[PDB]
């Protein structure tokens, strides 16, 4: 049904370089979902994770943990993670997080999201949940929830920061329940000490802006 959650199966596994003894053993760890009621949403999800390690992709993630094992260096190690974030009025909101460390200073994190519409069988983009035209009105809104999360920081007064970290886009948007989320890469409008911000800005911002039907059912 619609409006009951669909049911999920974890796949989790943590492998090790075969034959390799100690503490720098090279290790791929995997953590990902399959969806028995919707299987379309099994290779989407495994895909989108395939994209978080790039040059053409491996076929599959035993393709690329077998690739990762195969030539990584002493103390590599390679994080995929793939949970239901949320799901609410047919929409399934799935969370992306990476990690990679390929014996830098240290490791390489990635976020995304899986916006999945049970109504239409389809993952929604940006332009998908606009109404035409209205790109530029989301990010002036985006700017709005930007001050906001400046303010909740204590940054609104330090200019410094602000001219070091000006407002910047974010590919990952998510259609949560309580307001839209934008989540931000590290280093991108902010040092690794904050992690991953998330901006959010409130449904009654994108009246006109975000298609009426994509709202939340309350």
Not at 15 to 39: A, M, R, S
Not at 42 to 51: F, K, S
Not at 126 to 155: I, R, S, T, Y
Request: glycine share 6%; hydrophobic share 35%.
């Amino acid at each position: 049904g619609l409006d009951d959650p669909l049911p999920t199966e974890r796949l989790a596994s943590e492998h090790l370089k075969p034959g390799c003894q100690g503490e720098q053993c090279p290790l791929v760890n995997i953590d990902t979902l399959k969806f028995p009621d919707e299987p379309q949403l099994d290779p989407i999800v495994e895909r989108a994770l395939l994209e978080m390690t790039r040059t053409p992709l491996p076929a599959s993630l035993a393709a690329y943990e077998r690739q990762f094992l195969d030539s990584a260096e002493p103390g590599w190690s390679s994080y995929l993670q793939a949970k239901v974030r949320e799901q609410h009025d047919g929409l399934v909101i799935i969370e992306l997080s990476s990690y990679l460390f390929t014996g830098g200073a240290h490791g390489m994190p990635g976020r995304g999201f899986i916006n999945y519409d049970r109504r239409q069988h389809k993952v929604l983009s940006l332009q998908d949940m606009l109404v035409p035209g209205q790109e530029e009105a989301f990010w002036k809104q985006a700017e709005l929830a930007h001050k906001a999360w400046l303010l909740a920081n204590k940054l609104d007064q330090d200019a410094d920061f602000q001219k070091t970290w000006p407002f910047q886009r974010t590919p990952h948007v998510a259609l949560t329940f309580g307001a839209v989320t934008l989540k931000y890469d590290a280093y991108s409008i902010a040092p690794y000490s904050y992690a991953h911000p998330e901006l959010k800005i409130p449904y009654p911002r994108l009246n006109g802006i975000v298609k009426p039907n994509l709202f939340p059912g309350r």
